[PDB]
Design a protein around this ligand. Structure first.
Ligand SMILES: NC(=O)c1ccc[n+]([C@@H]2O[C@H](COP(=O)([O-])OP(=O)(O)OC[C@H]3O[C@@H](n4cnc5c(N)ncnc54)[C@H](OP(=O)(O)O)[C@@H]3O)[C@@H](O)[C@H]2O)c1
Length: 340
């Protein structure tokens, strides 16, 4: 039984405002590469990829919190891809590749097993992106929540991100006219060139968001896929069509504010008869087969594209997570901990 070093990213303590790299601490611990005797229904894994996700910011402040907080002194946890080294669980065996909740470290003794699934060709990292939680988020928000119909107009914010880039391609599959906003020229070019968006604009260079939306949506928006909230959401509301739908997926412009911004155009919910509906992807896990059945053939034919941002090494993970809130990532942010 080899006992080896185990680098970990430890959560320091609760924060306010924007997260900093000193809120996460590199610690070198030790681990024996065997499931402990008397420790049952557990899986010991070597972590291969880690996902960086905006919701992780909310785990860094103590609040009624919608996701359980990080524990100070303990490793950051989140979605990852890992290889089973040893198992006391009947459904996992040495060599299996899994996806699910694991530790921000080289090796994790996963004690529940509820939060992991065995990986069924495509890049391993896809299982925490288009074939994982962000892909399921895009599928549930667009197809289940938004009720898209052929010919409808669709606006997507954070459109080059892990979720948004898929929403735009689903909208094209549905025969919709789709526009996205993103924060750099490169992201805007990628929206039109690889994600098949009909148009796109850099919201950071638009001094009048209402005017920008009217450029692209002269007769209004049928479906707004909201990833950002805040001023963008407020500009969208008067530009919705009657009976338009807003899929409230996230509001990343708010996650680092002590006081959330006021949204002032909600009267448009009445005047435009809008259905604004939020959702949490965990309540849609039963749709994973429907996601796979749709996107796996398209990926194989190269008819749907997925762009990832791969940070190299566990030590790069804190900066990769902080970069989400400045738009440093181009596509789905992942961390490569080890090859395998
Ligand atoms: N409901 C659910 O269950 C669920 C599940 C997963 C994700 N979500 C939400 O979905 C949204 C997108 O997630 P993702 O994983 O795809 O992240 P992502 O788009 O891959 O990365 C985050 C992006 O947010 C944009 N951003 C950051 N700060 C911003 C600001 N102040 N204003 C506008 N845009 C900003 C940046 O893109 P730009 O360069 O374009 O600014 C950045 O690249 C997030 O709000 C997340 O919380 C919800």
């Amino acid at each position: 039984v080899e006992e080896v070093s185990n680098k970990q990213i430890i959560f320091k303590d609760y924060i306010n405002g924007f997260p900093k790299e000193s809120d996460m601490i590199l610690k070198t611990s030790t681990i024996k590469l065997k499931v402990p005797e008397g420790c049952n229904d557990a899986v010991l894994v070597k972590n291969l990829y880690l996902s960086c996700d905006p919701y992780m910011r909310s785990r860094m402040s103590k609040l009624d919190n919608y996701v359980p907080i990080f524990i100070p002194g303990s490793p950051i946890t989140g979605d990852g891809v890992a290889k089973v080294l040893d198992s006391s669980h009947p459904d996992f065996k040495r060599g299996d590749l899994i996806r699910g909740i694991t530790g921000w470290e080289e090796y994790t003794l996963i004690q529940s097993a509820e939060f992991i699934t065995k990986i069924q060709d495509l890049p391993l990292s896809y299982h925490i992106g288009i074939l994982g939680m962000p892909g399921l988020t895009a599928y549930a928000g667009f197809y289940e929540i938004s009720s898209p119909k052929e010919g409808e107009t669709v606006f997507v914010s954070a459109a080059s991100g892990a979720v948004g880039q898929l929403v735009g391609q689903f909208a094209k599959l549905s025969g919709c006219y789709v526009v996205g906003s993103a924060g750099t020229k490169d992201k805007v070019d990628m929206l039109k060139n690889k994600f098949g968006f009909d148009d796109a604009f850099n919201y950071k260079e638009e001094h009048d968001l209402d005017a920008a939306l009217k450029r692209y949506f002269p007769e209004g928006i049928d479906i707004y896929f909201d990833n950002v909230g805040g001023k963008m959401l407020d500009a969208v509301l008067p530009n919705m069509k009657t009976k338009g739908r807003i899929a409230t997926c996230g509001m990343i412009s708010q996650y680092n504010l002590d006081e959330a911004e006021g949204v002032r155009n909600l009267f448009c919910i009445m005047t435009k008869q809008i259905r604004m509906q939020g959702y949490l992807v965990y309540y849609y896990r039963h749709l994973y087969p429907k996601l796979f059945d749709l996107v796996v053939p398209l990926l194989r034919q190269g008819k749907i594209n997925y762009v990832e941002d791969v940070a190299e090494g566990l030590e790069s993970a804190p900066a990769a997570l902080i970069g989400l809130f400045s738009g440093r990532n181009v596509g789905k942010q992942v961390v490569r901990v080890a090859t395998e």
